[PDB]
Amino acid sequence: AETVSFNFNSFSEGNPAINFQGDVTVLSNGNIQLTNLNKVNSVGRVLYAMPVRIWSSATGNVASFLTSFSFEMKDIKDYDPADGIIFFIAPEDTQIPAGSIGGGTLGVSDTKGAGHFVGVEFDTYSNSEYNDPPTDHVGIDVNSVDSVKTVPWNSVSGAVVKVTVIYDSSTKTLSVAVTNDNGDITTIAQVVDLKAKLPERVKFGFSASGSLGGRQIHLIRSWSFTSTLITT
Amino acid sequence: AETVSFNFNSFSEGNPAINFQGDVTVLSNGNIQLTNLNKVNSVGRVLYAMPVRIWSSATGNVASFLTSFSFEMKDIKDYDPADGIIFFIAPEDTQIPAGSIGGGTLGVSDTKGAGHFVGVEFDTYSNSEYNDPPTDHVGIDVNSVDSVKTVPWNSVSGAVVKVTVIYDSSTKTLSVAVTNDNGDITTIAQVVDLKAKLPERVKFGFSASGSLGGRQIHLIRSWSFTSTLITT
Amino acid sequence: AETVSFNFNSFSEGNPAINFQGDVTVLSNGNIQLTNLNKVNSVGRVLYAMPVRIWSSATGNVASFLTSFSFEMKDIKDYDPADGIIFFIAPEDTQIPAGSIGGGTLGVSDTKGAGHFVGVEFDTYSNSEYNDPPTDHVGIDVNSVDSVKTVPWNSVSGAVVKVTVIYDSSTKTLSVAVTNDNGDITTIAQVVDLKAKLPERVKFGFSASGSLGGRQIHLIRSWSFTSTLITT
Amino acid sequence: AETVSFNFNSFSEGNPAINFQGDVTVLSNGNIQLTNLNKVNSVGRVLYAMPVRIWSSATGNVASFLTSFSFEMKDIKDYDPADGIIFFIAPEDTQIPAGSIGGGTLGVSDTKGAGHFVGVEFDTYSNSEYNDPPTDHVGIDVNSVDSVKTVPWNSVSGAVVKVTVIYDSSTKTLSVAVTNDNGDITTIAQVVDLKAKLPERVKFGFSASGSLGGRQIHLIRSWSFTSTLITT
Ligand SMILES: O=C(CCC(=O)N[C@@H]1O[C@H](CO)[C@H](O)[C@H](O)[C@H]1O)NCc1cn([C@H]2CO[C@H]3[C@@H]2OC[C@@H]3n2cc(CNC(=O)CCC(=O)N[C@@H]3O[C@H](CO)[C@H](O)[C@H](O)[C@H]3O)nn2)nn1
Ligand SMILES: O=C(CCC(=O)N[C@@H]1O[C@H](CO)[C@H](O)[C@H](O)[C@H]1O)NCc1cn([C@H]2CO[C@H]3[C@@H]2OC[C@@H]3n2cc(CNC(=O)CCC(=O)N[C@@H]3O[C@H](CO)[C@H](O)[C@H](O)[C@H]3O)nn2)nn1
Ligand SMILES: O=C(CCC(=O)N[C@@H]1O[C@H](CO)[C@H](O)[C@H](O)[C@H]1O)NCc1cn([C@H]2CO[C@H]3[C@@H]2OC[C@@H]3n2cc(CNC(=O)CCC(=O)N[C@@H]3O[C@H](CO)[C@H](O)[C@H](O)[C@H]3O)nn2)nn1
Ligand SMILES: O=C(CCC(=O)N[C@@H]1O[C@H](CO)[C@H](O)[C@H](O)[C@H]1O)NCc1cn([C@H]2CO[C@H]3[C@@H]2OC[C@@H]3n2cc(CNC(=O)CCC(=O)N[C@@H]3O[C@H](CO)[C@H](O)[C@H](O)[C@H]3O)nn2)nn1
Ligand SMILES: [Ca+2]
Ligand SMILES: [Ca+2]
Ligand SMILES: [Ca+2]
Ligand SMILES: [Mn+2]
Ligand SMILES: [Mn+2]
Ligand SMILES: [Mn+2]
């Protein structure tokens, strides 16, 4: 089998294993800060630099994967704590959408909320234009920030959040477990056919955005990943 | 919400938080050893002593859970490396089946392979009587060691194996990710309705067994768990 | 710290983690075959596709690394069993030298034997033009196939050879242990300053070559690697 | 060429291939447990029972060696996690020092920290009396627990640690690569003249110790070794 495996306990500028897009910076403590607090419609994204072959047009086989990551969102004075973080999967050529308005697009979609990606969003602002639920939520996204499914959640300012994601290729199930600061777990799961929605070669990563009035600290603290694709 | 949370980095026999059944021992290094290498049809099981409420007859709500554990199976001289370990969920009064033959029953079922439990098995011996696949496998079990579903796997002697399990109550999906020695990940997922198959209060644990000619070292190294049941 | 880790138990065409250069083919059993047995001056090379940051111009720190691989060289009828395999480190833009004569150049150097690379060679033909010792040898190469140091060795046709390499950044020591078919070990070690000889970002890989009369089967069976760079 | 080669995937009490010294026990899972958790100044050691000819008095030749082993250190309640494990080389008659205080001596030296041995220590307690660095470390020891050289390291409780050691006789270089749980590699290398510091035949092994307050689980899980001495 063909396996991609990596582990990030911290990050650094100049690591060729990571692609930095837009307003991303690396802090002295090793955290990735995705948005620029002094910029309007800030968008920042980090991708694992090596494309991952999630399915093969030759065999028809689809990869399974296990990934864990930790993040932190923290309020800043005067601005609305917005807009959130999205763990996403997209074609290997993926770039921040041209003329991105940031905000509710989470740096992955156009103004209408459409894009070419699969993702798990940690949404901290209710955008009526994307049919967002009224509270903070975890959502499963398939080519749109108008989520296929959401679950109520609570983004606590300054809290370290732990996420575990399992994609089971045979059932096409994307399962997510979110470990909150109050000790409770939040789960969400959805059948998503990655072979039907995405090309063979993809990139994995994180994106976050803000607006003129909606800004917060978006931090990626750690990321581990393993994908395995059965080969002929 | 109602949350049960625990973490075992090590295990000890004086700790009332675990119930010990059958031939199980705790080694001085802190590991749980489920079977006795010198006994015919050895069966050893371990359960978290406190019953966990997984669903409510009042609200109809079912808990979600995230659990991770690590185990090790190691070959012993002159014996077939058998039979395997099962992570299981059973009614709170669960006991080793009376007159257990161990072996392919994995200490949770009768001779016909039937029992009252939901489990994830790490099977290392092909029992034709339980329609086992020809190789080592991970199976999702619902009241039978004749698995609802299996996935090929490889039990590497002396390797530390890491497992992550997500149960998403809304989709009723039990998703499993197993991290092997060769670096590959193996996943298996199955829709299992816990309300329909198990009582409101259950015990979680591990079981392993052997036969006259089938024996191996079965070890539980660590276990973390979090369940959350919505009470509104 | 910044760590790069990978493990290849087998190889496949289409794996984005591997760059194929020249006459390389992947066999149905998963082995990489580096040279074409029917081509004059055949050269084949495989590289890990991601550039590896081996030193930082910001901190002055140099990475340490541990790598293991298994290869096989097998005689073919009538041709001289030549020329061997080189495990090498080179600038990220590395290509087979233009107008390569293959042969004693091992696909990494020009006709005079000069190139931009650091390598461990498994040399099976004595090239007087590169001051080769009279027998098969393991050599440490610094920008030349005229080795800084060599040790007598024996390339056994059809034998699986295991190699372990340690690069200790603090002492700048490259240490090699070669495990033969007859059970004996061969070692060679050399102080090589990678920060002085190579750029910050590099590619790691394997190269092999042949000539008109010098041809043999050159196989790469497995490859594991871990590098760690202290960050500040 | 005179070669010594062995492989231990597990260990057993009834095997004359290993010499057991002091408080050492074999657990039912096959691991060697070096210290007794209920004893003051506990010292336990294991040696490969056959002496290894590391050098010739006839030719003046010195052996090269390649060795790999895996170990585990685990914290125990109410005791300081101390003192660590040493992989050592000593005269064939080597015994635990008479009236050993255990602790910082690592079971290989006297109260002043002096002994007759060459070793690689995995030291988890800072002994100012042996000029230990302030954190956990890997050290290269020559007749003293006051290390010739150290490198900062981190002993993770319950983690399986893999070590690879290369001794290159021509450069007299002892190179060590330590693979941690967080994925990082730690290396240390030192020129050590084995012919000048040790006798013709030596014993290879492992030692660990504790004190009244400093105690932890010290486990040896596996050990492979190959040495080759050129006889021509
Ligand atoms: O000061 C106070 C009271 C302070 C306070 O805490 N008061 C508390 O009151 C309590 C009881 O109420 C208690 O008494 C308590 O003791 C007391 O302390 N209010 C007055 C007040 C404060 N802002 C803030 C909050 O919301 C406004 C303003 O600052 C940011 C935000 N904005 C509004 C706008 C206007 N553009 C637009 O609507 C067009 C574009 C637009 O909305 N894009 C969206 O902007 C979002 C962010 O708002 C997202 O990023 C979206 O994704 C993005 O699409 N752009 N940015 N607006 N009005
Ligand atoms: O020696 C060799 C070849 C060894 C070898 O390495 N050969 C190598 O081959 C190489 C090339 O291939 C090379 O040539 C190499 O040079 C050469 O060394 N075979 C001859 C041989 C060896 N056993 C072993 C393996 O299987 C047998 C025997 O030892 C264990 C097992 N059992 C079972 C019994 C007693 N029954 C019963 O209890 C009957 C009921 C029964 O089968 N319950 C099941 O028993 C299982 C375990 O077998 C499971 O636990 C099941 O869950 C359980 O239901 N009693 N024993 N049986 N026959
Ligand atoms: O048949 C036998 C004895 C066989 C045998 O088993 N004899 C046994 O002896 C026993 C007792 O000892 C018993 O009596 C037994 O009964 C008897 O059977 N020799 C007569 C004989 C055989 N070739 C062979 C070996 O070497 C020659 C020939 O086949 C291959 C090679 N090449 C080379 C060429 C074309 N040049 C060039 O390309 C010139 C440039 C050149 O030399 N580049 C180098 O070529 C190398 C490869 O040779 C390397 O690849 C170098 O890196 C490369 O730089 N074209 N060919 N040349 N002459
Ligand atoms: O409880 C606490 C804080 C616990 C804690 O978690 N605090 C947390 O702090 C957090 C924020 O920081 C939070 O606030 C949190 O809420 C709070 O819980 N300290 C008070 C405290 C605890 N021991 C421990 C640690 O060190 C002592 C004690 O237990 C073991 C050790 N020993 C030693 C002895 C007996 N001597 C001798 O034998 C003298 C000779 C001696 O020192 N040979 C050396 O002993 C070593 C081992 O200590 C090595 O083995 C050396 O190789 C050996 O040479 N007898 N005992 N000594 N003093
Ligand atoms: Ca939103
Ligand atoms: Ca040559
Ligand atoms: Ca110490
Ligand atoms: Mn949303
Ligand atoms: Mn050469
Ligand atoms: Mn020390």
Side-chain angles (χ1 to χ4, degrees):
Chain A
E2 188 172 291
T3 293
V4 176
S5 202
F6 58 85
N7 182 40
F8 288 100
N9 299 314
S10 57
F11 302 95
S12 64
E13 309 183 328
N15 188 166
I18 298 279
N19 298 140
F20 297 97
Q21 299 185 334
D23 301 329
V24 189
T25 61
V26 178
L27 306 186
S28 53
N29 68 357
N31 295 174
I32 280 171
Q33 182 182 121
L34 289 167
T35 57
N36 184 330
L37 284 350
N38 292 288
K39 193 164 155 168
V40 174
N41 296 171
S42 178
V43 177
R45 329 201 305 181
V46 292
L47 299 153
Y48 184 67
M50 187 183 292
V52 176
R53 190 178 155 220
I54 53 151
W55 66 269
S56 171
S57 60
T59 64
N61 298 163
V62 185
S64 279
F65 66 78
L66 169 66
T67 191
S68 290
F69 54 89
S70 71
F71 69 78
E72 186 190 325
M73 282 181 277
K74 188 152 120 195
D75 301 0
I76 65 165
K77 200 198 178 200
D78 307 308
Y79 298 95
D80 274 340
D83 275 276
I85 302 169
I86 187 172
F87 164 66
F88 73 110
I89 322 165
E92 74 193 314
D93 73 339
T94 189
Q95 295 291 143
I96 295 167
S100 174
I101 59 156
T105 73
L106 301 177
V108 291
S109 71
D110 59 26
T111 299
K112 293 202 184 285
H116 195 182
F117 67 93
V118 171
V120 180
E121 51 161 72
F122 302 91
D123 197 344
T124 77
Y125 184 91
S126 188
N127 294 82
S128 59
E129 67 273 24
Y130 307 134
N131 292 306
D132 269 339
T135 75
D136 296 349
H137 54 284
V138 180
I140 291 173
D141 292 358
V142 182
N143 292 326
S144 182
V145 289
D146 187 339
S147 301
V148 167
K149 199 200 257 185
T150 69
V151 62
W153 174 68
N154 179 28
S155 185
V156 175
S157 182
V160 175
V161 182
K162 294 192 260 179
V163 184
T164 295
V165 182
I166 299 170
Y167 184 73
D168 176 67
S169 73
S170 181
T171 60
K172 296 164 175 70
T173 304
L174 187 70
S175 300
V176 184
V178 185
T179 302
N180 307 262
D181 120 274
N182 82 142
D184 297 7
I185 44 99
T186 306
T187 67
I188 189 170
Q190 178 64 49
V191 169
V192 181
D193 187 347
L194 294 179
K195 186 181 190 194
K197 299 298 179 188
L198 284 162
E200 292 161 84
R201 283 171 153 228
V202 294
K203 279 186 186 183
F204 287 83
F206 302 94
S207 181
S209 57
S211 68
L212 186 138
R215 314 187 191 178
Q216 69 193 158
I217 297 159
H218 302 102
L219 301 167
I220 308 301
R221 292 173 55 86
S222 62
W223 185 26
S224 63
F225 179 96
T226 314
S227 206
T228 298
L229 170 70
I230 301 268
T231 47
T232 188
Chain B
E2 188 172 288
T3 292
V4 176
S5 203
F6 59 84
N7 184 40
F8 290 100
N9 299 312
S10 64
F11 304 103
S12 55
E13 217 186 292
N15 192 168
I18 301 291
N19 298 145
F20 297 92
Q21 298 176 345
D23 300 325
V24 54
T25 58
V26 173
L27 300 194
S28 50
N29 73 348
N31 296 173
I32 283 170
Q33 184 183 120
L34 297 164
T35 57
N36 185 328
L37 282 351
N38 351 111
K39 195 161 279 167
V40 174
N41 297 169
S42 179
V43 177
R45 327 197 309 181
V46 133
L47 307 151
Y48 183 68
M50 183 179 60
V52 181
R53 194 167 74 126
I54 56 157
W55 66 268
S56 167
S57 53
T59 65
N61 291 171
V62 184
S64 281
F65 66 77
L66 170 66
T67 192
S68 289
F69 53 88
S70 70
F71 69 78
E72 187 191 324
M73 283 181 278
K74 188 151 120 192
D75 300 0
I76 66 166
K77 302 108 271 103
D78 308 308
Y79 295 95
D80 276 336
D83 271 84
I85 302 167
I86 188 172
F87 163 64
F88 73 109
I89 326 166
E92 70 192 307
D93 70 342
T94 188
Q95 295 293 143
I96 295 169
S100 174
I101 59 155
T105 74
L106 301 178
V108 290
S109 72
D110 59 26
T111 299
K112 294 201 199 291
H116 192 187
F117 67 93
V118 172
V120 181
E121 53 163 72
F122 301 90
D123 196 340
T124 74
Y125 183 92
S126 189
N127 297 86
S128 56
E129 67 272 24
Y130 306 133
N131 292 307
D132 270 338
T135 74
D136 293 352
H137 54 285
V138 179
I140 288 176
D141 293 356
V142 181
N143 294 327
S144 182
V145 290
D146 189 335
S147 301
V148 168
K149 200 201 257 185
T150 70
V151 62
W153 180 65
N154 177 30
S155 185
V156 177
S157 183
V160 174
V161 181
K162 292 202 279 184
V163 183
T164 294
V165 183
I166 300 169
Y167 184 74
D168 175 68
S169 73
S170 182
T171 61
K172 298 167 173 72
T173 303
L174 186 71
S175 212
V176 186
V178 189
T179 301
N180 304 240
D181 189 65
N182 81 142
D184 296 9
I185 46 105
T186 305
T187 69
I188 188 170
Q190 178 63 49
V191 169
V192 179
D193 185 347
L194 299 188
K195 186 155 53 165
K197 300 299 179 191
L198 291 161
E200 289 159 86
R201 293 167 94 227
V202 294
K203 279 185 185 184
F204 286 82
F206 301 88
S207 182
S209 58
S211 64
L212 187 134
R215 312 184 193 179
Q216 69 192 157
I217 296 156
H218 302 102
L219 301 168
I220 309 299
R221 294 172 54 86
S222 64
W223 184 28
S224 65
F225 179 98
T226 313
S227 65
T228 300
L229 170 65
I230 291 164
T231 46
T232 186
Chain C
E2 179 171 298
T3 294
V4 176
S5 204
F6 59 85
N7 185 38
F8 291 98
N9 300 311
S10 56
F11 303 95
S12 61
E13 306 184 332
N15 187 164
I18 300 284
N19 298 140
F20 298 97
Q21 300 185 330
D23 300 331
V24 184
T25 61
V26 179
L27 306 187
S28 54
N29 70 352
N31 296 174
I32 281 171
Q33 184 184 121
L34 287 170
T35 56
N36 184 327
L37 283 349
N38 294 288
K39 184 164 158 175
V40 174
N41 298 169
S42 178
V43 178
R45 329 201 306 182
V46 292
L47 299 153
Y48 183 67
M50 183 175 56
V52 174
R53 194 228 226 156
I54 51 157
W55 65 269
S56 163
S57 60
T59 65
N61 292 171
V62 185
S64 280
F65 65 77
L66 168 68
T67 191
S68 292
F69 53 88
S70 76
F71 69 78
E72 186 191 323
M73 284 180 277
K74 187 152 116 79
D75 300 1
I76 64 167
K77 202 198 176 199
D78 311 304
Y79 299 99
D80 275 335
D83 277 87
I85 302 168
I86 188 171
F87 163 66
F88 73 110
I89 323 167
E92 70 192 307
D93 70 339
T94 190
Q95 294 293 144
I96 294 166
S100 175
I101 60 154
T105 74
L106 300 176
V108 290
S109 72
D110 59 26
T111 299
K112 295 207 277 307
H116 194 178
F117 67 93
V118 171
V120 181
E121 55 162 70
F122 302 91
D123 197 346
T124 76
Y125 183 90
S126 188
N127 297 85
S128 56
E129 66 274 24
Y130 306 134
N131 292 307
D132 270 338
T135 73
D136 295 352
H137 54 285
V138 180
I140 287 169
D141 292 357
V142 181
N143 295 325
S144 182
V145 289
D146 187 336
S147 301
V148 164
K149 201 201 256 184
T150 69
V151 63
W153 173 68
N154 179 27
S155 186
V156 176
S157 182
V160 175
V161 181
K162 292 188 171 82
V163 183
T164 295
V165 183
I166 300 169
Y167 184 72
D168 176 67
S169 72
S170 182
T171 60
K172 297 165 175 69
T173 303
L174 185 71
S175 198
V176 184
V178 184
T179 301
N180 296 292
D181 180 62
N182 81 143
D184 295 8
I185 46 103
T186 306
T187 68
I188 189 170
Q190 178 62 50
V191 169
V192 182
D193 188 348
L194 298 186
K195 186 182 189 194
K197 299 297 179 188
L198 289 170
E200 289 164 84
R201 291 159 47 126
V202 296
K203 280 186 186 184
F204 286 83
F206 301 95
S207 182
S209 57
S211 66
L212 185 137
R215 311 187 193 178
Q216 69 193 158
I217 296 158
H218 302 102
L219 301 167
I220 308 302
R221 292 173 54 86
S222 62
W223 183 28
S224 62
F225 179 97
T226 312
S227 66
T228 298
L229 173 74
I230 297 273
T231 47
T232 178
Chain D
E2 187 179 71
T3 291
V4 176
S5 203
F6 58 85
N7 185 39
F8 290 97
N9 300 311
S10 56
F11 304 96
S12 62
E13 299 202 320
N15 190 177
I18 290 154
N19 301 134
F20 295 97
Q21 299 186 332
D23 299 329
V24 64
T25 58
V26 181
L27 309 184
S28 48
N29 73 351
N31 295 174
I32 282 170
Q33 183 183 123
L34 290 168
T35 55
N36 183 330
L37 283 349
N38 294 286
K39 195 166 156 287
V40 174
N41 298 169
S42 179
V43 177
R45 330 198 306 182
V46 293
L47 300 152
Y48 183 68
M50 188 183 294
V52 180
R53 195 176 177 202
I54 48 153
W55 58 265
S56 171
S57 58
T59 66
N61 290 158
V62 186
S64 280
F65 65 78
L66 168 67
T67 191
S68 291
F69 53 88
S70 68
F71 69 78
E72 187 191 323
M73 285 180 277
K74 189 152 119 196
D75 299 1
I76 64 165
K77 195 216 220 166
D78 307 310
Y79 294 96
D80 276 337
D83 277 87
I85 302 171
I86 188 172
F87 163 65
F88 74 108
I89 323 168
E92 49 217 316
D93 73 333
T94 189
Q95 295 292 145
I96 294 166
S100 173
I101 59 154
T105 67
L106 301 177
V108 291
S109 73
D110 59 27
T111 299
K112 295 205 240 92
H116 195 176
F117 67 93
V118 172
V120 180
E121 55 164 64
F122 301 90
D123 190 349
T124 75
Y125 184 90
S126 188
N127 297 86
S128 59
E129 66 274 24
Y130 306 133
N131 292 307
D132 270 337
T135 73
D136 293 351
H137 56 283
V138 180
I140 289 175
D141 293 357
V142 182
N143 295 325
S144 182
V145 290
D146 188 336
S147 302
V148 167
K149 200 202 255 182
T150 70
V151 63
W153 174 66
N154 179 26
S155 186
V156 177
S157 182
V160 174
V161 181
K162 291 198 271 174
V163 183
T164 294
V165 183
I166 298 172
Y167 184 73
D168 175 67
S169 73
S170 180
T171 58
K172 296 166 171 175
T173 303
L174 188 68
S175 300
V176 185
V178 185
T179 303
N180 314 302
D181 183 65
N182 81 329
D184 294 9
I185 46 103
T186 305
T187 65
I188 188 172
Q190 177 63 49
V191 169
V192 180
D193 188 347
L194 293 194
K195 194 178 201 85
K197 300 297 179 190
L198 289 156
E200 248 201 287
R201 285 175 167 88
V202 286
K203 267 187 198 172
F204 286 81
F206 301 96
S207 182
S209 57
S211 65
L212 188 133
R215 314 186 191 177
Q216 69 192 157
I217 291 156
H218 304 101
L219 301 167
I220 309 298
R221 293 172 55 86
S222 63
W223 184 27
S224 64
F225 179 97
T226 312
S227 66
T228 299
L229 175 70
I230 291 146
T231 48
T232 187

